[PDB]
Ligand binder design. Structure first.
Ligand SMILES: Nc1ncnc2c1ncn2[C@@H]1O[C@H](C[C@@H](N)CC[C@H](N)C(=O)O)[C@@H](O)[C@H]1O
Ligand SMILES: Nc1ncnc2c1ncn2[C@@H]1O[C@H](C[C@@H](N)CC[C@H](N)C(=O)O)[C@@H](O)[C@H]1O
Ligand SMILES: [Zn+2]
Ligand SMILES: [Zn+2]
Lengths: 183, 183
């Protein structure tokens, strides 16, 4: 009864609407649970930006491919999480750094899952935390938050406004259809 | 706060999505009530086919512009109503006639309002009733029935598949947003 790709009821399937975009930014999804939950919105990022990398998160045996990706000096990697959680010695930044393309590492799940991922992933500890400027959502007619909404604001912070606008529109489509599914 | 044109919550406003189409068929809406109610779907026809004529229905004082339109020999006028309610001497048909462009007269309101309009409008009595083949909605991945849904079937019956597809997509957008605004 539910689409296996877009996770909405079948009469509400949005797959035909999806128009991927392009961006200088790149996302990496560390997923606490890979089945796939409609309430987890990190997957919407991958619909709009299909170069999004996604992993199942592990407490003790992180993937070598994940380690390779976050250690690739081609990118500037950063952990996406509210600044108040970062240690006093943790580097916190407020814009993507200039030059190398950013790799936005999202902790995709619930808060206690996100928080657990933030604290028990030592391969992320030497990375800067970016504090997202959520007020930028106003320029996309979204409430100035879902993991997909955080990503929209990040894309806008990086000047990837085409992908921000495409993800906003895709997010609103999913959220509207989801609510309707509950009706 | 609701949009005054598309009658949805302001955050769910659909006006920007509307792309009118073109059709050989033409519609005429006799609306019981012209505030407008969100759940009256005759107005969705006008969004897709802006040459749709619309009048306020009156029992005793029909507009002369309405009388003039239905007496225009340029069109083949017909009243859109379930065939079971026609009189035995009423000409019932099952396809739009061939040759002159069809003028589909919709009774836009609720069922008791439509049935009242059907019975108390002497200017429509010498007109044929077209019985709508609603199984055609299957071709548009749709399935009582909204006035806008009946119009999609009529458009398809007349070969106006582009307008029928555009009205289907529009009706589903309205219906999905209306359900979500209800959530
Ligand atoms: N200020 C913020 N900075 C960074 N990420 C944020 C912020 N506020 C919310 N988030 C995101 O929201 C997640 C936690 C929950 N809100 C997730 C809700 C829901 N499961 C979703 O996927 O949208 C975090 O792991 C981040 O992805
Ligand atoms: N079998 C049918 N043949 C012709 N018109 C129909 C048929 N079934 C429904 N309709 C039309 O669709 C309306 C259905 C009503 N329930 C109105 C629902 C709602 N108020 C709307 O405006 O969409 C009728 O009043 C007619 O205008
Ligand atoms: Zn789907
Ligand atoms: Zn509107």
């Amino acid at each position: 009864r539910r689409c296996q790709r877009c996770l909405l009821p079948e009469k509400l399937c949005l797959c035909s609407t999806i128009t991927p975009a392009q961006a200088k930014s790149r996302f990496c999804l560390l997923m606490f649970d890979t089945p796939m939950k409609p309430s987890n919105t990190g997957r919407l990022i991958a619909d709009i930006l299909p170069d999004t990398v996604a992993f199942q998160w592990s407490r003790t045996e992180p993937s070598q491919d994940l380690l390779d990706l976050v250690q690739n000096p081609y990118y500037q990697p950063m952990v996406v999480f509210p600044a108040s959680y970062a240690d006093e010695q943790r580097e916190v930044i407020f814009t993507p750094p200039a030059g190398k393309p950013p790799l936005f590492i999202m902790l995709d799940g619930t808060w206690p899952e996100a928080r657990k991922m933030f604290r028990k992933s030592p391969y992320l500890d030497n990375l800067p935390v970016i504090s997202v400027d959520l007020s930028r959502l106003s320029a996309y007619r979204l409430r100035e938050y879902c993991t997909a909404e955080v990503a929209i604001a990040l894309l806008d912070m990086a000047g990837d406004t085409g992908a921000a606008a495409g993800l906003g529109e895709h997010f609103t489509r999913f959220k509207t259809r989801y609510l309707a599914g509950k009706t």
